[PDB]
Amino acid sequence: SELTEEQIAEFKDAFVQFDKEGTGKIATRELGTLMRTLGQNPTEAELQDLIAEAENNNNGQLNFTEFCGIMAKQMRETDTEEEMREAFKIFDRDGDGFISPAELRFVMINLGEKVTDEEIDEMIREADFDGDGMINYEEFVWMISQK
Ligand SMILES: [Ca+2]
Ligand SMILES: [Ca+2]
C-alpha cells in the first residue's frame, strides 16, 4: 500500500527473482506474474500496454523504476481505475449503462466545466466505436484518458 522500507524490499526481492536476461531488468512477460504474487492487480489493458509496447523494442525488459512506478500508482489507492468508473456513473444520469449527449451536458455543468452540446457530442463520437451515440464504461475510459 506504500513504498515503505519493508515493502520496497518485498517487491525488490520478487523483482530480482524473475531477472532472466540479467540486464538488471526482468522480462515484461513476468510483470503480470509478479503482480500476482504481490498484492498488486492492474487492469488487463494496462499489463497489455507495457507488454505490447515493450513487446518489440528491448526483448520486453523492465527496470526497478518501471515496476515500482506502477506500484506507486496502485499503492496510492488500489488501481486508480475506480475513480474513472465513478465519474462514468455520474455522467450517466440513467441506469441503462450508457450515456447520452444530454446527460453529459448536465453533469459537466455540475462539475464546473461549461461545455457546448457540440464539443461534447464530438467527444462522444470519437469514443463511440460500436456506433450508437452512447458511452459505456469502456468508451468512457478511452475519452477520459485523453484529458
Ligand atoms: Ca444514460
Ligand atoms: Ca457506444
Ion ligand 1 nearby residues (CB, 5 A): 92, 94, 96
Give the method of determination: NMR
94 C-alpha to ligand 1 centroid (Å): 4
Distance from the first to the final alpha carbon of the chain: 26
> C-alpha grid cell for residue 52?
505490447
Question: Which residue is listed with cell 468508473?
Answer: 85
3-state DSSP assignment of residue 62: strand
Structure letter (DSSP) for residue 55:
T
Reference 117, options 135, 102, 134; nearest CA is: 102
Closest CA to 32 of 24, 42, 23: 42
Q: How far is CA 88 from CA 85, 103, 131, 147, in A?
A: 5, 11, 18, 14
> What are the structural domains, with CATH classification, of the chain?
1-77 (1.10.238.10), 78-147 (no CATH)
